[PDB]
Amino acid sequence: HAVCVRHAFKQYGSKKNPNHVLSDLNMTVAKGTIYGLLGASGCGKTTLLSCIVGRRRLNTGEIWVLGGKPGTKGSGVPGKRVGYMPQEIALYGEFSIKETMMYFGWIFGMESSEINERLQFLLNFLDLPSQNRLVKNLSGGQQRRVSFAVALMHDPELLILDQPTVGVDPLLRQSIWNHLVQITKDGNKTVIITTHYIEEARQAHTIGLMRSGKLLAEESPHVLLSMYGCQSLESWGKIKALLQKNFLRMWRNVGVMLFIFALPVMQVILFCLAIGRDPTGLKLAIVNHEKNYTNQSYQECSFDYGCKFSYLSCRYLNNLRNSTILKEYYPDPESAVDAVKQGHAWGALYFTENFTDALVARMALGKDADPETLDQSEVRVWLDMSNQQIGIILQRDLQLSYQDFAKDLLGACEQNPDLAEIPISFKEPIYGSNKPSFTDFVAPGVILTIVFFLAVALTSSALIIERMEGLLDRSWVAGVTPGEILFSHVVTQFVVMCGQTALVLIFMILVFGVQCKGDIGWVIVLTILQGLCGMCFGFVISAICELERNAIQLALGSFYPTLLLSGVIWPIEGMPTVLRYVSTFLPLTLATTSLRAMLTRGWSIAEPAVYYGFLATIIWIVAFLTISMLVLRFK
C-alpha cells in the first residue's frame, strides 16, 4: 500500500457556484504495480496527483501515502524517496544539462562522483545532445527528456509521472514506456503514470479510470476487457545545491554585475564635487560715485594707504572677497537696479558722492552724529534674494567684509584692532569648528543612506524570480524547506554587499577628506549593519508582492519618505512634537544620529547616544526577518 486515499472531498470556487472536482475518490495503489490513471479531459485528475504529493490541501479528506499524510514526519512525500514530474516543463532555462542534473543531484544527498557516473548512462539511454548545451536551445521534445531524466536518476520508490511522453516520436515513446516496466520487475518501485495514449497504456497492471469525480474501476487491462468492452481500449546538501545556482546567476550576466560595482563610486564622486562648495561665479553692480566712469568692467581704484583717509569707498572694495564676487560698474543707481532686475547681476551697491567725508565724520564723532550725516555714509545695497541660498551668502559676506575694513581703519592708524567688536565673544567650540559647512553635516547621513538603498535594489527581485523561472513547485517536493531559500539568499547577497560597502567608505574617507575623529573600526560595523537591514527590507517587499510590476514601485516609492523622516538635510528637531516622536523608531533616524556622534564628536560605543543606533538597527533586522519568514511559510 504505497498510496491509499479514502473519502477525498475537494471543490473549487465559492459556495454559490461550486465545482465539485472530486466526490469520493476511493483508490488503492499496491507496491510493485504500474498504476495507470486513465480518464477523460475535464475531470479532476491532475488535481489528484498534485494532492498526493502534498501540493494542495485535500479539504477535509483522509490521505495516506508511503506511511502517512504528506508533510508529516510519519510519511515520506517530501524527501528523496518520492519521484515527481510536472505536467509542464518546470526547468530552468539558463542551466545546462550537466548543471540542471547536478542542482537536483546533491539535493537528495547524492555524491558528486556518482551523479556524473550515471549521467552518461541516462544520456546514452535516451538520446540527447552534448551535456554542455544549456536547456533553452533544446527543442520541444528534447526539453521533456531532460525533465524525465532529472527526477528519475536518484532511484526513488514512488513515481508520480504525469504525461511523460507528450511531444516525442513513437519510437522514443515505446523506449520510455519500455523502461518503467523493467525497473518495476523486481518489486522495487511503483509508477502512477497517467497518459492520454490509451492504447499505449496496455502494459500497466492496475489500470484506473475516472468518470465523475471518483474512480469508476481499477482492474487489470486484461480483466477490464470482457466486462465493459470487447477489444482494444474502449541540511548541508540542500544549502550547497542552491548556493552555486545563485552565484552562477550573477556570472551569466557579467557586465551588469560590474555595473553595480561602478555605481557607489559614481554616486559618491558626484556628491563630493557638488554639495558643499560655495558659489564662485556671482557678480555685482558697483556704482561708486567718486571716480570717473570709463568703460564697463573697469574703474580706477588708486586709494590711499596710511593714516590719511581718502577714497574710503574704494577701500571697502578690494577688501571684500577677491574670488567669489565679480565687479561690474554702472554710472547711475537707477541703472544698477535695472540690470539686477533683468537677471544681469545679483545685487547693486551704491556709494554716495560724499562718502569719505560722511564716513570720516561718523567715526571721529561718537554719539553726536546728526541724522543728515548718518544718512550719506551708508552703503545702499539692493539684493536679488530670489535664490535663498546665494543671497544668504551675499549678505553674509558684505557685512563680514566690513569687519576687516573696520579693523584696517582702527588697527593701522589710531588704536588696537579690537574695539570694533561686538561684546558677544564666541570663544572656541568644544566639539565642532568655528567655520561650519554644509558638506560636513550631511555626509554622515548620506553614507548610511547610499548603502541602505543599494542593498534594497539588490534584494528586491530575489524572492520574486523563483516562480518566474520555474524549478520551485517541483523543488518543494524535493525537501527544500522555505526557510532555506531565504537563508541562502542572505548569504549570497551579503558577500557582494560588502564589496560595494567598502568602496563607499574608501572613496569617502581616503580619496575625499572626511574627518574620522572617532574610532574607525566601529564605523565599518555600523555601516554593514545598516546595509544588512536594507537587504532585509527588500525581502519583505518581495515576499508581500506577487507580480513583478507590483514590487518595483513599492521600494521605489520609499525613496523620498525615508529621506525626509530621517535627519539628512535638516535637523530632526525641526519637526513638530508628534511627528518627531513617531520618526524616532525608524531604521535610519537613530543610526545617523549615532554616526554623527562618532565621526565628528569622537565618542565611543559606551556612550548612551552611540549604542542606541546599534540597538535600534538590530531589532529592525530581526523584525524584517520574522515577517518575511512568516509570509513565505504562509504561502
**Residues forming the annotated binding site for Mg(2+)?**
46, 162
Residues 60-119 that bind Mg ion (CB under 5 A): 87
Instruction: Examine residue 5 and tell whether it contacts ligand ATP (CB under 6 A).
Output: no
Instruction: Find the binder of ligand ATP among 17, 41, 297, 425 (CB under 6 A).
Output: 41
**Distance between alpha carbon 399 and the CA centroid of its chain, in Å?**
49
3-state SS record for 45-86: CHHHHHHHCCCCCCCCCEEEECCECCCCCCCCCCCCCCCCCC
Instruction: Find the binder of ligand ATP among 139, 387, 403, 550 (CB under 6 A).
Output: 139
Q: Where are the alpha helices (DSSP H) in 507-607?
A: 520-544, 548-556, 559-565, 579-582, 589-599
Only one of the segments 54-62, 155-163, 398-406, 525-533 lies at the binding site for Mg ion (rule: CB under 5 A); that segment is 155-163
Instruction: Find the binder of ligand ATP among 141, 432, 483, 571 (CB under 6 A).
Output: 141
Taken in order 316, 320, 322, 324, the sign of the CA dihedral is: negative
Report the residue number, 110 or 210, with the smaller CB distance to a copy of itself.
Answer: 210
Instruction: Find the binder of ligand ATP among 12, 125, 247, 581 (CB under 6 A).
Output: 12
Report the residue number, 4 or 275, with the smaller CB distance to a copy of itself.
Answer: 275
Instruction: Examine residue 432 and tell whether it contacts a copy of itself (CB under 8 A).
Output: yes
Instruction: Examine residue 42 and tell whether it contacts a copy of itself (CB under 8 A).
Output: yes
Report the residue number, 279 or 483, with the smaller CB distance to a copy of itself.
Answer: 279
- Return binding residues for ATP: 12, 41-42, 45-47, 133, 141, 196
Beta partners for residue 285, in sequence order: 328, 348
C-alpha cell at 521: 573600526
- Return binding residues: 12, 41-42, 45-47, 133, 141, 162, 196
The CB-of-255 to a copy of itself minimum distance in angstroms stands at 10
HSE toward the beta carbon, residue 166, CA cutoff 13 A: 14
Chain gaps in the chain, named by the residue before each (C–N > 2.5 Å) = 234
Among ligand ATP, a copy of itself, Mg ion, none, what binds residue 223 when CB lies within 5 to 8 Å by partner kind? none
Residues 477-506 that bind a copy of itself (CB under 8 A): none
**Residue 566 — left, alpha, or beta (φ > 0 → left; ψ -120 to 50 → alpha)?**
beta
Only one of the segments 40-48, 231-239, 361-369, 598-606 lies at the binding site for ligand ATP (rule: CB under 6 A); that segment is 40-48
Residues 106-135 that bind a copy of itself (CB under 8 A): 127
Residues 218-257 that bind a copy of itself (CB under 8 A): 234, 253, 256
Instruction: Examine residue 47 and tell whether it contacts ligand ATP (CB under 6 A).
Output: yes
Amino acid at 525: V
Strand 215-218: give its sheet, edge to edge. Answer: 37-38, 208-210, 215-218
Q: Output 336-345 pairs: Cβ under 8 A, ≥24 positions apart.
A: 336/285, 336/286, 336/287, 336/382, 337/382, 339/285, 340/285, 340/382, 340/384, 341/384, 344/283, 344/285, 345/283, 345/284, 345/285, 345/384
Instruction: Examine residue 474 and tell whether it contacts Mg ion (CB under 5 A).
Output: no
- Radius of gyration for the alpha carbons in the chain, expressed in angstroms and rounded: 40
User: CA separation (Å) from 176 to 7, 69, 155, 170, 270?
Assistant: 33, 30, 16, 10, 63
Among ligand ATP, Mg ion, a copy of itself, none, what binds residue 621 when CB lies within 5 to 8 Å by partner kind? none
Instruction: Find the binder of ligand ATP among 2, 37, 85, 138 (CB under 6 A).
Output: 138
Q: What is the CB neighbour count within 10 angstroms for residue 232?
A: 9
Among ligand ATP, Mg ion, a copy of itself, none, what binds residue 573 when CB lies within 5 to 8 Å by partner kind? a copy of itself
C-alpha cell at 352: 554716495
In the block, cell 475535464 appears at 42
Report the residue number, 132 or 295, with the smaller CB distance to a copy of itself.
Answer: 132
Instruction: Find the binder of a copy of itself among 188, 296, 318, 437 (CB under 8 A).
Output: 437
Indicate the pairing of strand 208-210 with strand 37-38. Answer: parallel
Instruction: Find the binder of ligand ATP among 4, 30, 43, 363 (CB under 6 A).
Output: 43
Instruction: Examine residue 212 and tell whether it contacts ligand ATP (CB under 6 A).
Output: no
What would the x/- binding string for ligand ATP be over residues 15 to 34, using CB under 6 A?
----x-x-------------
What would the x/- binding string for ligand ATP be over residues 160 to 199, using CB under 6 A?
-------x--------------------------------
Report the residue number, 4 or 369, with the smaller CB distance to a copy of itself.
Answer: 369
C-alpha cell at 106: 546533491
Instruction: Examine residue 42 and tell whether it contacts ligand ATP (CB under 6 A).
Output: yes
**Residue 471 — left, alpha, or beta (φ > 0 → left; ψ -120 to 50 → alpha)?**
left
| Binding residues vs ligand ATP (CB under 6 A) | 12, 19, 21, 41-47, 137-142, 167
| Binding residues vs Mg ion (CB under 5 A) | 46, 87, 162-163
